């Protein structure tokens, strides 16, 4: 009965802390938010114009693939910051000891990052710089290995995910469900976390039958997506290890070194 209130507070935490909603993202991608459109980045020259000021600091320069890799890090570290504030706005999360909070964010943020990335992605590319840019998938494909191999799987997941047609209120509960996961290694108060997760799942199962009355099997499809996200992030972490090993001139932000340390 109270699930509607617990879930409303999660929605508010979502709207207060995340830079862009799926709502705002889809209106830009479809040309319904402004009479100015995102600047399309599809090669070195458009990339250079975007950096020069059209659209928008980092470690010293090295090459274009690496440059784009540093822009991906900057966006992930920033999204880690929004996920930390989102999580702390969930009272039951803030009741956990600080070390359990860190353990859940450490192993959950990338799963949650890649779930939210679908919102800014279509089959042809994705938005950057708060919607001022659009970077083409074909450009990101043209990057040299291993940087194109770490990017392209996220588009595959994103286009299938977007076929579920979730709105921001669905996503807020789904993200909370990914972060409050009782399985993370070294978790201290596991029973307390599992109870929170279960509450969010029940809130989510209720929310879907109200918001998507005609979509059947959506809840078990979303549970499957959470299992798919765990595997996508396992493969992402393996690809990050190879970059650490073979791309020695490429630096990793220190906060990402901590997440990938284990
Ligand atoms: O392991 C880590 O934590 C760091 C390593 C991540 C490496 C893989 O990152 C991927 C993969 C697929 C899709 C999106 C991203 C990065 N993201 C971007 O929004 C993003 C930002 C800027 C550009 C960009 C800017 C300028 C010119 N060209 C491209 C493109 C994409 C989302 C945060 C995930
Ligand atoms: C900002 C929230 C995201 C934080 C994710 C980074 C977690 O790094 C971990 O921080 C712990 C210190 O508490 C260390 O003990 C671990 O060795 C380290 O892996």
Curated annotation (Swiss-Prot):
Swiss-Prot/TrEMBL keywords: Activator, DNA-binding, Metal-binding, Nucleus, Receptor, Transcription, Transcription regulation, Ubl conjugation, Zinc, Zinc-finger
Keyword Coiled coil assigned: no
Subcellular location: Nucleus
UniProt GO cellular component terms: chromatin; nucleoplasm; nucleus
UniProt GO MF annotations: DNA binding; DNA-binding transcription factor activity; DNA-binding transcription factor activity, RNA polymerase II-specific; DNA-binding transcription repressor activity, RNA polymerase II-specific; linoleic acid binding; lipid binding; NF-kappaB binding; nuclear receptor activity
GO biological process terms, semicolon-separated: adipose tissue development; apoptotic process; apoptotic signaling pathway; axon ensheathment; cell differentiation; cell population proliferation; cell-substrate adhesion; cellular response to hypoxia
Tissue-wise expression: Ubiquitous with maximal levels in placenta and skeletal muscle.
Post-translational modification: 'Lys-48'-linked polyubiquitinated; leading to proteasomal degradation. Deubiquitinated and stabilized by OTUD3.
This protein's record includes keyword Transcription: yes
Domain of life: Eukaryota
NR LBD domain: residues covered: 39-262
Bilayer-crossing regions: none
Similarity comment: family membership: Belongs to the nuclear hormone receptor family. NR1 subfamily.
Subunit structure: Heterodimer with the retinoid X receptor. Interacts (via domain NR LBD) with CRY1 and CRY2 in a ligand-dependent manner.
Function: Ligand-activated transcription factor key mediator of energy metabolism in adipose tissues. Receptor that binds peroxisome proliferators such as hypolipidemic drugs and fatty acids. Has a preference for poly-unsaturated fatty acids, such as gamma-linoleic acid and eicosapentanoic acid. Once activated by a ligand, the receptor binds to promoter elements of target genes. Regulates the peroxisomal beta-oxidation pathway of fatty acids. Functions as transcription activator for the acyl-CoA oxidase gene. Decreases expression of NPC1L1 once activated by a ligand.
Protein name (database record): Peroxisome proliferator-activated receptor delta
Organism encoding this protein: Homo sapiens
Gene name, Swiss-Prot/TrEMBL: PPARD
């Amino acid at each position: 009965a109270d699930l509607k209130a617990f879930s409303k507070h999660i929605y508010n935490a979502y709207l207060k802390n995340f830079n862009m909603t799926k709502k705002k993202a889809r209106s830009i991608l479809t040309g319904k938010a402004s009479h100015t459109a995102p600047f399309v980045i599809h090669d070195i020259e458009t990339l250079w114009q975007a950096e020069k000021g059209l659209v928008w600091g980092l470690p010293p320069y090295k090459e274009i693939s690496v440059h784009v890799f540093y822009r991906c890090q900057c966006t992930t570290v920033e999204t880690v910051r929004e996920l930390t504030e989102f999580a702390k706005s969930i009272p039951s999360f803030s009741s956990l000891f600080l070390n359990d909070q860190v353990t859940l964010l450490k192993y959950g943020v990338h799963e949650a990052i890649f779930a939210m990335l679908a919102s800014i992605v279509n089959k042809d590319g994705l938005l950057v710089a708060n919607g001022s840019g659009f970077v083409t998938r074909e450009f990101l494909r043209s990057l040299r290995k291993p940087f194109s191999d770490i990017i392209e799987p996220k588009f595959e997941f994103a286009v299938k995910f977007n076929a579920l047609e979730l709105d921001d209120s669905d996503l807020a509960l789904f993200i909370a469900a990914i972060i409050l996961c009782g399985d993370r290694p070294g978790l201290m108060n596991v029973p307390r976390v599992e109870a929170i997760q279960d509450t969010i799942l029940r809130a989510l199962e209720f929310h879907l039958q109200a918001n998507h009355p005609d979509a059947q099997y959506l809840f078990p499809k979303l549970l499957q997506k959470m299992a798919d996200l765990r595997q996508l992030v396992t493969e992402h972490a393996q690809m990050m290890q190879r970059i650490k090993k073979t791309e020695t001139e490429t630096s990793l932000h220190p906060l990402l070194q901590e997440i990938y340390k284990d």
